[PDB]
Amino acid sequence: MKEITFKINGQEMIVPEGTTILEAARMNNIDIPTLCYLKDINEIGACRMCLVEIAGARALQAACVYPVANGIEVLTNSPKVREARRVNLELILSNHNRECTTCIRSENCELQTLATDLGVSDIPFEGEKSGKLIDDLSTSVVRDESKCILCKRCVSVCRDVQSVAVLGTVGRGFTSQVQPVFNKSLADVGCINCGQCIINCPVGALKEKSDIQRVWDAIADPSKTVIVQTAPAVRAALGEEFGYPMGTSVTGKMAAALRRLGFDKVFDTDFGADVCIMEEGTELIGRVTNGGVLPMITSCSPGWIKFIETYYPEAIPHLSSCKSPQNITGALLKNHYAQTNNIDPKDMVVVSIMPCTAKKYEVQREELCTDGNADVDISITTRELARMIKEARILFNKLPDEDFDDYYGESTGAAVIFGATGGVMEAAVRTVADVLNKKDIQEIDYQIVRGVDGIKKASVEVTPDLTVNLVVAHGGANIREVMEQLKAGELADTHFIELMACPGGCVNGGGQPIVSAKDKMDIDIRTERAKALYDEDANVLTYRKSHQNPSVIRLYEEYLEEPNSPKAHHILHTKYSAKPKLV
Amino acid sequence: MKEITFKINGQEMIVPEGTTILEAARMNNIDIPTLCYLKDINEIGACRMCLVEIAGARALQAACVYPVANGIEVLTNSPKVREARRVNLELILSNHNRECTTCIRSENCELQTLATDLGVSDIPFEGEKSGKLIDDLSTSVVRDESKCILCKRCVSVCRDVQSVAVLGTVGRGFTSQVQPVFNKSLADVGCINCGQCIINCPVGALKEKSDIQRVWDAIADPSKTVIVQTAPAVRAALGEEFGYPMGTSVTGKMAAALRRLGFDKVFDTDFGADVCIMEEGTELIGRVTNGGVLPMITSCSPGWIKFIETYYPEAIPHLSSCKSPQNITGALLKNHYAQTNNIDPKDMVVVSIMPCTAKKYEVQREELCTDGNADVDISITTRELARMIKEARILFNKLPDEDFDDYYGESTGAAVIFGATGGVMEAAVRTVADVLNKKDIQEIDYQIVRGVDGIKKASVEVTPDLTVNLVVAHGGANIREVMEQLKAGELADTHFIELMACPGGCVNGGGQPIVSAKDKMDIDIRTERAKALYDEDANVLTYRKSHQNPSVIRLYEEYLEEPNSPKAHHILHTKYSAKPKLV
Amino acid sequence: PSGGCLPESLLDTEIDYDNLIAAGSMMGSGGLIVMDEDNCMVDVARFFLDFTQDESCGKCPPCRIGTKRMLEILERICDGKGVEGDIERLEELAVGIKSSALCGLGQTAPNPVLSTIRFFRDEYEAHIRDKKCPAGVCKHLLDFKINADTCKGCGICAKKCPADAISGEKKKPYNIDTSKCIKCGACIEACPFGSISKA
Ligand code: SF4
Ligand code: SF4
Ligand code: SF4
Ligand code: SF4
Ligand code: SF4
Ligand code: SF4
Ligand code: SF4
Ligand code: SF4
Ligand code: SF4
Ligand code: SF4
Ligand code: SF4
Ligand code: FES
Ligand code: FES
Ligand SMILES: [Zn+2]
């Protein structure tokens, strides 16, 4: 490392090489506006809102992009800089529609914070905007260029850290805009419903499909009974849009709130996740004992499996025939509960929450059907739930706590850690060690590959005869490079491959409410999601193991016989097909 | 008291009779929207947003002022009432100006919160609005009726609480505007410039004129050295601007933030308040030894002395000739510090931060000039300071602490409670008792008059020969009734009447930042800022008597000679004339 | 304005409480007004709608804002500037206003619009699509044609056209420029022969 000298506002400072003015000023308690910059990803400076005066310069320079030098004295409180940024903010304000009463985020849009911060008074500059069209045909994500200000961050985050690269810039002048290839909809091109496309756009030009009207229609019919469902990782994100301090569990409070909304039944993803882990261990034993296709790979996320079937159809025979836990819960609820309670399956509606935005795609898929009936007919997100509860606008901070119902809402810590990154393999090795060798483990040593973050390797001795290797890969680049090396067959030795579509776990998923880039500067939010989840896990007073739950074996010798029964082969396992590619 | 039994959403409540469903449901942790309502003053329900269906009714009723009754059932989640609220929402939004990017209120406008609250998307409407007329001719308040949405909260608070009522509603339909009489301006009528009107408006129809361009020119002029004064109550609610928890004191952080602004010198009010109390006590002992004009009143808050001069000038011999304490310290700084540092009095600039709005009127006055120069130059309130420090944008929570300077940074609790209710005259009684008979009192009780709250009577002997009668009145109606009995001569026996213009004292200045209706529902905010200032007063660990201060005695000995000197009569003591009444 | 119209299909209506409310009208003070084919039924709805705007007490926002914001839909039809689908925008305010009123006008204000659309929907389509007034009353939607047989061709109406949309030669019926005059109608009475009719 090389030490270099500067002076900020008359204060001397020694910094290592690579330190820009912006981060050093933030370290030295000085704050400067930015829209262009985000950590490690987007460094173009093209917003031109981060201007600081540098003495001896011909014109002003952007703080984010400018690298330091030896002994330069700079100032940030001149009339020149304030008038220049006022002119540029007046200019950039002209395009986006000023109808902020209908802007989707509204109060969180930081452009509004810059407007109310920089004292913009009038808009002297009227005019005409770009060519308008709205592509409201995609089932997940909808664009609107009337609000976009062309910050390039969406195409940058899709291009590199996701390794998808399906967006680009088109045109010159005002014809410059962000588009996919050859201006068709996102539904027919190789988009993966990543959700990082929407979470980083600074203006809300990227939006979900607000499908609350049929939620209201379903709850409006008295003859239809409604069964709501909570994902195991949503509770660490509601207080974020309620302004709570970091990592506050609002579990029983939101249980009481959804009970006050009048919904007929409440349940969680926990029990179906337990069933799925037990099942996946059973096909683990089946494929190992019969020398099956190696490695075997789970199916927790719809995103990367759709990515594989739209990109790599030659990799099909390595998949798992089981589905996502939510589908399993929907199927068991519309079969076993329906037969027990004598309620007609087409007279029930089930709605569930999960922040992963790719789920709205699989509800479109017809192949996940039980006797020609879709397993779950409707689902909303955490932001969608936030918008609906602010329609209900119940005074959230003064609720008591409640518990879920019988049988299907019981709790274990092994699927409290399900929402974390790699807890699925942890619970799987726990249940296979308890079944085959009676081993009780809680945590596993992890050796991360040097130079790459997001890939993780381990070797766990499940039995003294058979040692199983662990590979956990989360993040698009990690998935891309493990795909490339398994394509050459370099990693035939291992047995578990954990492919996770979103980076940083589903606690870094799409549906979670927006955080500004300022708050991501101090603490990475996945760390406090991890601490809240781990405090929830370590305080589970009854069970830490999955298969030791009485209710799952009760339903096993009651209705589902054993895992991999022929009937379970017809209702719990199914095949996948390749999808057409027009990239 | 009568007990009323009613069920809301199937939940049975026993209430006192006369209470309505809004606050009863708020007690049951249920919220109903409101724009129209404020407690104890405005119950008309013209906003038509608080609708709810009542079973057994022909049409819908507004929950704001609907009285409770026995045996009635209330359900608040029918689709029809949601549709009604939404359609009233777009009919409001088709009138109310949509360029909410450059609104002054910007962030926490009630209308934006309700627009996101009901989640409306489409505006299918084109219409014609009210006329656009800018009345930028007054001194403090500028109205933009293009934004005004006919809340009638402003006219109500000026009508009853102020008992001034210089506003009305005229015209029919779109011509129905709230206006002063005769189509004049506020400077053309007897507006008190209280500030209650500008703080209770929920949409920012009322604003205050910027002077910050002159401030920024002043700080950019190297020929002018800048002094910035501070108020004792400026930090009472400033931290609530940054989402701090309630009653937080940031005085050292405030001083460090001000010193990070490049401001040359920073003083406070406290010595000026101490000396103002000194000559108040000195003229008291003079008039009780010479048989002066009684009953005697203060001259502190400019709003009420403007009130009593313009409305009923017959009590003009009862005023004190001394100026406000900030004027006293401004004159002292302009002469004695100027001759101390040998700097020409035309070469520095003075700016002071006051939460009372009358000071920007008072600076425009012509008779308060000393040595051929104005006493003070620029007056600033907390909202202006707030987005000024947010404009320079030093991230406030991570500053260190700093103290004030030599001489004029020391503080005593008697001027800590200067902004509080009656602490000025409390300290006056302490000083005169210590001068005449050496009595140690730390607190004196007050007597609440039955029938009207806000008027407090106290009568504690200074000496067994001399008892002094004390009453303190805050609020325009309270001023009107005590003025009425003074003309009736009911309090001809008393010695002191202390007039606070805004209610709750000098600690409820209109220049404090806006509060929410919800925040006014939960905790009455003068209680919390009262606890903050009382903990500050108990936290004053040096001096709780004014006259023991060695610095002020030194200034008495070196420049002020003797209390009520002829030089003090020349400098510290002035005269007011008959201002015209256009009412 | 407090009630509604009763067309020719309801001549055997027993006028009482339960029948005319089932017919969507109320008696009020009991005023009875009879209409014929000689006046257009579009703008007379605006005539009762004129009454409610100029008398509204100005308290509730629907009876202030929603009223005049509902005039411009009618007059853009009444001058031919409207578009298809505007009548369905009227039906959005149809049930919203009546459930959101405080003053007694607001409940009973839009019911003249409600009464006429469920019988006379087709004649709006003539105003909207054909751009023609059936009664020849809507000034900006009417045009004048002369008859060649009855017109002498003297040219008295040629002197009375302020926009000079009529021209020609003596002793023969003239020519009419439809788009050029302001449709003031000053020429129709100046003809002593009554040769001008409304189309
Ligand atoms: S993104 Fe645009 S429309 Fe949305 S709140 Fe911000 S400025 Fe308003
Ligand atoms: S869509 Fe959003 S992220 Fe992409 S360039 Fe436009 S503003 Fe930036
Ligand atoms: S959804 Fe995924 S593939 Fe589509 S734009 Fe966003 S990040 Fe790229
Ligand atoms: S990893 Fe991300 S994309 Fe995949 S299911 Fe979880 S939240 Fe959705
Ligand atoms: S009232 Fe003011 S703050 Fe509210 S939306 Fe309109 S301009 Fe913005
Ligand atoms: S000043 Fe404010 S409260 Fe008064 S009518 Fe106008 S918008 Fe309503
Ligand atoms: S400032 Fe006070 S006196 Fe003046 S109009 Fe407002 S409420 Fe009335
Ligand atoms: S703070 Fe209140 S009492 Fe003091 S001058 Fe201002 S308005 Fe008047
Ligand atoms: S309907 Fe009644 S309350 Fe509403 S504006 Fe008209 S007269 Fe006033
Ligand atoms: S006045 Fe009558 S007769 Fe003479 S030219 Fe005109 S239409 Fe013909
Ligand atoms: S209607 Fe009037 S303007 Fe048109 S042709 Fe006749 S007289 Fe001339
Ligand atoms: S990020 Fe804004 S100028 Fe560089
Ligand atoms: S406050 Fe307006 S309806 Fe109650
Ligand atoms: Zn017509």
PDB file of N, CA, C and O in Angstrom, chain B residues 44 46-48 51 60 80 84 87-88 91-92 94-95 124-128 150 152 172-174 176, chain C residues 53-62 64-66 68-69 72 76 89 92-93 96 98-102:
ATOM      1  N   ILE B  44     -65.899  20.163  12.108  1.00  0.00           N
ATOM      2  CA  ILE B  44     -66.882  20.485  11.082  1.00  0.00           C
ATOM      3  C   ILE B  44     -66.947  19.323  10.101  1.00  0.00           C
ATOM      4  O   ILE B  44     -68.007  19.018   9.544  1.00  0.00           O
ATOM      5  N   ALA B  46     -65.389  18.866   7.084  1.00  0.00           N
ATOM      6  CA  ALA B  46     -65.603  19.227   5.692  1.00  0.00           C
ATOM      7  C   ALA B  46     -64.624  18.531   4.755  1.00  0.00           C
ATOM      8  O   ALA B  46     -64.753  18.662   3.533  1.00  0.00           O
ATOM      9  N   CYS B  47     -63.643  17.800   5.295  1.00  0.00           N
ATOM     10  CA  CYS B  47     -62.664  17.155   4.426  1.00  0.00           C
ATOM     11  C   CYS B  47     -63.285  16.003   3.655  1.00  0.00           C
ATOM     12  O   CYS B  47     -62.886  15.743   2.514  1.00  0.00           O
ATOM     13  N   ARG B  48     -64.259  15.322   4.263  1.00  0.00           N
ATOM     14  CA  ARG B  48     -64.973  14.190   3.668  1.00  0.00           C
ATOM     15  C   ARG B  48     -64.003  13.099   3.211  1.00  0.00           C
ATOM     16  O   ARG B  48     -64.082  12.570   2.102  1.00  0.00           O
ATOM     17  N   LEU B  51     -64.911   8.809   6.017  1.00  0.00           N
ATOM     18  CA  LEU B  51     -66.180   8.121   5.859  1.00  0.00           C
ATOM     19  C   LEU B  51     -66.111   6.693   6.386  1.00  0.00           C
ATOM     20  O   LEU B  51     -65.056   6.050   6.381  1.00  0.00           O
ATOM     21  N   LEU B  60     -73.954   7.295   3.656  1.00  0.00           N
ATOM     22  CA  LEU B  60     -72.806   7.182   4.537  1.00  0.00           C
ATOM     23  C   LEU B  60     -72.615   8.394   5.462  1.00  0.00           C
ATOM     24  O   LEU B  60     -73.076   9.494   5.158  1.00  0.00           O
ATOM     25  N   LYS B  80     -67.273  -0.222  -0.741  1.00  0.00           N
ATOM     26  CA  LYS B  80     -67.904   1.039  -1.116  1.00  0.00           C
ATOM     27  C   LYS B  80     -67.259   2.231  -0.426  1.00  0.00           C
ATOM     28  O   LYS B  80     -67.080   3.283  -1.050  1.00  0.00           O
ATOM     29  N   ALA B  84     -65.391   5.405  -2.065  1.00  0.00           N
ATOM     30  CA  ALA B  84     -65.752   6.783  -1.750  1.00  0.00           C
ATOM     31  C   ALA B  84     -64.525   7.602  -1.366  1.00  0.00           C
ATOM     32  O   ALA B  84     -64.338   8.725  -1.854  1.00  0.00           O
ATOM     33  N   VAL B  87     -62.417   8.275  -4.534  1.00  0.00           N
ATOM     34  CA  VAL B  87     -62.966   9.242  -5.488  1.00  0.00           C
ATOM     35  C   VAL B  87     -62.904  10.658  -4.927  1.00  0.00           C
ATOM     36  O   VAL B  87     -62.582  11.610  -5.658  1.00  0.00           O
ATOM     37  N   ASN B  88     -63.133  10.822  -3.615  1.00  0.00           N
ATOM     38  CA  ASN B  88     -62.852  12.126  -3.022  1.00  0.00           C
ATOM     39  C   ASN B  88     -61.380  12.487  -3.148  1.00  0.00           C
ATOM     40  O   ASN B  88     -61.054  13.666  -3.319  1.00  0.00           O
ATOM     41  N   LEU B  91     -60.781  13.856  -6.692  1.00  0.00           N
ATOM     42  CA  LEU B  91     -61.420  15.162  -6.839  1.00  0.00           C
ATOM     43  C   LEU B  91     -60.676  16.251  -6.071  1.00  0.00           C
ATOM     44  O   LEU B  91     -60.645  17.407  -6.505  1.00  0.00           O
ATOM     45  N   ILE B  92     -60.056  15.912  -4.938  1.00  0.00           N
ATOM     46  CA  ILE B  92     -59.162  16.884  -4.307  1.00  0.00           C
ATOM     47  C   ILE B  92     -57.919  17.110  -5.157  1.00  0.00           C
ATOM     48  O   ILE B  92     -57.518  18.255  -5.393  1.00  0.00           O
ATOM     49  N   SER B  94     -57.394  16.948  -8.282  1.00  0.00           N
ATOM     50  CA  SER B  94     -57.566  17.716  -9.508  1.00  0.00           C
ATOM     51  C   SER B  94     -57.589  19.218  -9.262  1.00  0.00           C
ATOM     52  O   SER B  94     -57.599  19.984 -10.230  1.00  0.00           O
ATOM     53  N   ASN B  95     -57.610  19.653  -8.008  1.00  0.00           N
ATOM     54  CA  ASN B  95     -57.559  21.065  -7.657  1.00  0.00           C
ATOM     55  C   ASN B  95     -56.214  21.499  -7.103  1.00  0.00           C
ATOM     56  O   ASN B  95     -55.752  22.596  -7.420  1.00  0.00           O
ATOM     57  N   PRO B 124     -57.579  10.598 -14.327  1.00  0.00           N
ATOM     58  CA  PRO B 124     -58.128  10.662 -15.688  1.00  0.00           C
ATOM     59  C   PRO B 124     -58.630  12.036 -16.080  1.00  0.00           C
ATOM     60  O   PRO B 124     -59.295  12.161 -17.116  1.00  0.00           O
ATOM     61  N   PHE B 125     -58.338  13.061 -15.289  1.00  0.00           N
ATOM     62  CA  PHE B 125     -59.093  14.305 -15.296  1.00  0.00           C
ATOM     63  C   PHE B 125     -58.231  15.467 -15.769  1.00  0.00           C
ATOM     64  O   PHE B 125     -57.035  15.527 -15.464  1.00  0.00           O
ATOM     65  N   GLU B 126     -58.842  16.373 -16.521  1.00  0.00           N
ATOM     66  CA  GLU B 126     -58.291  17.689 -16.795  1.00  0.00           C
ATOM     67  C   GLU B 126     -59.285  18.758 -16.350  1.00  0.00           C
ATOM     68  O   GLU B 126     -60.478  18.695 -16.650  1.00  0.00           O
ATOM     69  N   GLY B 127     -58.774  19.759 -15.643  1.00  0.00           N
ATOM     70  CA  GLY B 127     -59.655  20.783 -15.112  1.00  0.00           C
ATOM     71  C   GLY B 127     -58.967  22.126 -15.031  1.00  0.00           C
ATOM     72  O   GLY B 127     -57.823  22.295 -15.462  1.00  0.00           O
ATOM     73  N   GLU B 128     -59.693  23.088 -14.467  1.00  0.00           N
ATOM     74  CA  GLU B 128     -59.222  24.457 -14.311  1.00  0.00           C
ATOM     75  C   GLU B 128     -59.225  24.798 -12.830  1.00  0.00           C
ATOM     76  O   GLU B 128     -60.178  24.473 -12.114  1.00  0.00           O
ATOM     77  N   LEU B 150     -59.035  24.678   1.262  1.00  0.00           N
ATOM     78  CA  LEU B 150     -60.234  25.049   2.018  1.00  0.00           C
ATOM     79  C   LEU B 150     -60.398  24.193   3.270  1.00  0.00           C
ATOM     80  O   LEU B 150     -61.474  23.663   3.551  1.00  0.00           O
ATOM     81  N   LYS B 152     -60.196  25.320   6.315  1.00  0.00           N
ATOM     82  CA  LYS B 152     -60.765  26.183   7.345  1.00  0.00           C
ATOM     83  C   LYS B 152     -60.130  25.985   8.714  1.00  0.00           C
ATOM     84  O   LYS B 152     -60.689  26.439   9.718  1.00  0.00           O
ATOM     85  N   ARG B 172     -68.353  32.243  -4.265  1.00  0.00           N
ATOM     86  CA  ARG B 172     -69.162  31.043  -4.394  1.00  0.00           C
ATOM     87  C   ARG B 172     -68.465  30.046  -5.308  1.00  0.00           C
ATOM     88  O   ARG B 172     -67.968  30.402  -6.379  1.00  0.00           O
ATOM     89  N   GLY B 173     -68.436  28.792  -4.867  1.00  0.00           N
ATOM     90  CA  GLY B 173     -67.786  27.754  -5.649  1.00  0.00           C
ATOM     91  C   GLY B 173     -66.285  27.947  -5.677  1.00  0.00           C
ATOM     92  O   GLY B 173     -65.604  27.902  -4.649  1.00  0.00           O
ATOM     93  N   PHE B 174     -65.756  28.145  -6.883  1.00  0.00           N
ATOM     94  CA  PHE B 174     -64.337  28.426  -7.063  1.00  0.00           C
ATOM     95  C   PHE B 174     -63.948  29.801  -6.554  1.00  0.00           C
ATOM     96  O   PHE B 174     -62.805  29.991  -6.127  1.00  0.00           O
ATOM     97  N   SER B 176     -65.010  30.910  -3.853  1.00  0.00           N
ATOM     98  CA  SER B 176     -64.940  30.773  -2.401  1.00  0.00           C
ATOM     99  C   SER B 176     -63.484  30.593  -2.006  1.00  0.00           C
ATOM    100  O   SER B 176     -62.935  29.493  -2.074  1.00  0.00           O
TER     101      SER B 176
ATOM    102  N   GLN C  53     -74.675  24.605  -9.740  1.00  0.00           N
ATOM    103  CA  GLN C  53     -73.336  25.153  -9.580  1.00  0.00           C
ATOM    104  C   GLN C  53     -73.397  26.555  -8.991  1.00  0.00           C
ATOM    105  O   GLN C  53     -72.566  26.926  -8.155  1.00  0.00           O
ATOM    106  N   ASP C  54     -74.376  27.348  -9.413  1.00  0.00           N
ATOM    107  CA  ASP C  54     -74.475  28.732  -8.970  1.00  0.00           C
ATOM    108  C   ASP C  54     -75.139  28.890  -7.613  1.00  0.00           C
ATOM    109  O   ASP C  54     -75.189  30.011  -7.097  1.00  0.00           O
ATOM    110  N   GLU C  55     -75.647  27.813  -7.017  1.00  0.00           N
ATOM    111  CA  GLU C  55     -76.316  27.911  -5.731  1.00  0.00           C
ATOM    112  C   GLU C  55     -75.610  27.128  -4.629  1.00  0.00           C
ATOM    113  O   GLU C  55     -75.886  27.376  -3.449  1.00  0.00           O
ATOM    114  N   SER C  56     -74.652  26.267  -4.978  1.00  0.00           N
ATOM    115  CA  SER C  56     -73.978  25.402  -4.015  1.00  0.00           C
ATOM    116  C   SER C  56     -73.303  26.192  -2.900  1.00  0.00           C
ATOM    117  O   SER C  56     -72.597  27.172  -3.147  1.00  0.00           O
ATOM    118  N   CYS C  57     -73.525  25.749  -1.661  1.00  0.00           N
ATOM    119  CA  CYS C  57     -73.068  26.492  -0.495  1.00  0.00           C
ATOM    120  C   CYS C  57     -71.564  26.420  -0.298  1.00  0.00           C
ATOM    121  O   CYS C  57     -71.030  27.152   0.541  1.00  0.00           O
ATOM    122  N   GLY C  58     -70.872  25.558  -1.030  1.00  0.00           N
ATOM    123  CA  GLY C  58     -69.430  25.623  -1.054  1.00  0.00           C
ATOM    124  C   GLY C  58     -68.715  24.951   0.093  1.00  0.00           C
ATOM    125  O   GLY C  58     -67.585  25.338   0.404  1.00  0.00           O
ATOM    126  N   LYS C  59     -69.329  23.962   0.740  1.00  0.00           N
ATOM    127  CA  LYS C  59     -68.654  23.302   1.850  1.00  0.00           C
ATOM    128  C   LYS C  59     -68.058  21.967   1.429  1.00  0.00           C
ATOM    129  O   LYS C  59     -66.856  21.736   1.600  1.00  0.00           O
ATOM    130  N   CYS C  60     -68.881  21.073   0.892  1.00  0.00           N
ATOM    131  CA  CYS C  60     -68.212  19.812   0.632  1.00  0.00           C
ATOM    132  C   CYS C  60     -67.536  19.835  -0.734  1.00  0.00           C
ATOM    133  O   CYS C  60     -68.042  20.445  -1.679  1.00  0.00           O
ATOM    134  N   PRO C  61     -66.358  19.226  -0.827  1.00  0.00           N
ATOM    135  CA  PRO C  61     -65.564  19.294  -2.064  1.00  0.00           C
ATOM    136  C   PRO C  61     -66.256  18.701  -3.285  1.00  0.00           C
ATOM    137  O   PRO C  61     -66.027  19.206  -4.394  1.00  0.00           O
ATOM    138  N   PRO C  62     -67.087  17.615  -3.172  1.00  0.00           N
ATOM    139  CA  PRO C  62     -67.840  17.211  -4.370  1.00  0.00           C
ATOM    140  C   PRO C  62     -68.809  18.262  -4.888  1.00  0.00           C
ATOM    141  O   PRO C  62     -68.907  18.461  -6.102  1.00  0.00           O
ATOM    142  N   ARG C  64     -68.521  21.393  -4.567  1.00  0.00           N
ATOM    143  CA  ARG C  64     -67.745  22.455  -5.199  1.00  0.00           C
ATOM    144  C   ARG C  64     -67.044  21.971  -6.462  1.00  0.00           C
ATOM    145  O   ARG C  64     -67.314  22.460  -7.562  1.00  0.00           O
ATOM    146  N   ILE C  65     -66.154  20.995  -6.313  1.00  0.00           N
ATOM    147  CA  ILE C  65     -65.214  20.697  -7.384  1.00  0.00           C
ATOM    148  C   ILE C  65     -65.848  19.778  -8.410  1.00  0.00           C
ATOM    149  O   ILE C  65     -65.720  19.996  -9.619  1.00  0.00           O
ATOM    150  N   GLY C  66     -66.557  18.746  -7.948  1.00  0.00           N
ATOM    151  CA  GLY C  66     -67.076  17.745  -8.864  1.00  0.00           C
ATOM    152  C   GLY C  66     -68.135  18.279  -9.805  1.00  0.00           C
ATOM    153  O   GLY C  66     -68.363  17.708 -10.874  1.00  0.00           O
ATOM    154  N   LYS C  68     -68.364  21.559 -11.399  1.00  0.00           N
ATOM    155  CA  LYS C  68     -67.945  22.272 -12.604  1.00  0.00           C
ATOM    156  C   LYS C  68     -67.001  21.403 -13.414  1.00  0.00           C
ATOM    157  O   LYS C  68     -66.954  21.516 -14.644  1.00  0.00           O
ATOM    158  N   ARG C  69     -66.317  20.468 -12.749  1.00  0.00           N
ATOM    159  CA  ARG C  69     -65.503  19.494 -13.461  1.00  0.00           C
ATOM    160  C   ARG C  69     -66.363  18.523 -14.260  1.00  0.00           C
ATOM    161  O   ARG C  69     -65.840  17.748 -15.066  1.00  0.00           O
ATOM    162  N   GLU C  72     -67.578  20.385 -18.236  1.00  0.00           N
ATOM    163  CA  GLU C  72     -66.818  20.464 -19.485  1.00  0.00           C
ATOM    164  C   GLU C  72     -66.967  19.202 -20.318  1.00  0.00           C
ATOM    165  O   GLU C  72     -66.701  19.230 -21.522  1.00  0.00           O
ATOM    166  N   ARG C  76     -68.218  19.992 -24.235  1.00  0.00           N
ATOM    167  CA  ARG C  76     -67.358  19.567 -25.334  1.00  0.00           C
ATOM    168  C   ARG C  76     -68.127  18.677 -26.300  1.00  0.00           C
ATOM    169  O   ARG C  76     -67.815  18.639 -27.494  1.00  0.00           O
ATOM    170  N   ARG C  89     -67.056   8.046 -18.566  1.00  0.00           N
ATOM    171  CA  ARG C  89     -66.409   8.812 -17.507  1.00  0.00           C
ATOM    172  C   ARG C  89     -67.437   9.510 -16.633  1.00  0.00           C
ATOM    173  O   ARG C  89     -67.187   9.742 -15.445  1.00  0.00           O
ATOM    174  N   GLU C  92     -68.579   7.200 -13.881  1.00  0.00           N
ATOM    175  CA  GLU C  92     -67.681   7.066 -12.739  1.00  0.00           C
ATOM    176  C   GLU C  92     -68.095   7.994 -11.604  1.00  0.00           C
ATOM    177  O   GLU C  92     -68.032   7.624 -10.426  1.00  0.00           O
ATOM    178  N   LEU C  93     -68.527   9.211 -11.942  1.00  0.00           N
ATOM    179  CA  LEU C  93     -68.979  10.154 -10.924  1.00  0.00           C
ATOM    180  C   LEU C  93     -70.417   9.883 -10.510  1.00  0.00           C
ATOM    181  O   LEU C  93     -70.919  10.519  -9.577  1.00  0.00           O
ATOM    182  N   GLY C  96     -70.254   7.841  -7.205  1.00  0.00           N
ATOM    183  CA  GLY C  96     -69.305   8.391  -6.253  1.00  0.00           C
ATOM    184  C   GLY C  96     -69.840   9.605  -5.522  1.00  0.00           C
ATOM    185  O   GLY C  96     -69.672   9.733  -4.306  1.00  0.00           O
ATOM    186  N   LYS C  98     -73.036  10.696  -5.056  1.00  0.00           N
ATOM    187  CA  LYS C  98     -74.246  10.527  -4.257  1.00  0.00           C
ATOM    188  C   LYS C  98     -73.961   9.907  -2.897  1.00  0.00           C
ATOM    189  O   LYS C  98     -74.729  10.125  -1.953  1.00  0.00           O
ATOM    190  N   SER C  99     -72.884   9.141  -2.775  1.00  0.00           N
ATOM    191  CA  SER C  99     -72.481   8.578  -1.499  1.00  0.00           C
ATOM    192  C   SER C  99     -71.523   9.480  -0.739  1.00  0.00           C
ATOM    193  O   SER C  99     -71.122   9.133   0.376  1.00  0.00           O
ATOM    194  N   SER C 100     -71.157  10.632  -1.304  1.00  0.00           N
ATOM    195  CA  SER C 100     -70.136  11.477  -0.700  1.00  0.00           C
ATOM    196  C   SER C 100     -70.589  12.925  -0.593  1.00  0.00           C
ATOM    197  O   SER C 100     -69.845  13.839  -0.960  1.00  0.00           O
ATOM    198  N   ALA C 101     -71.793  13.159  -0.088  1.00  0.00           N
ATOM    199  CA  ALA C 101     -72.367  14.495  -0.024  1.00  0.00           C
ATOM    200  C   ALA C 101     -72.793  14.814   1.399  1.00  0.00           C
ATOM    201  O   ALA C 101     -73.207  13.920   2.145  1.00  0.00           O
ATOM    202  N   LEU C 102     -72.674  16.085   1.777  1.00  0.00           N
ATOM    203  CA  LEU C 102     -73.222  16.543   3.048  1.00  0.00           C
ATOM    204  C   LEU C 102     -74.460  17.400   2.833  1.00  0.00           C
ATOM    205  O   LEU C 102     -75.524  17.126   3.398  1.00  0.00           O
TER     206      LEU C 102
END
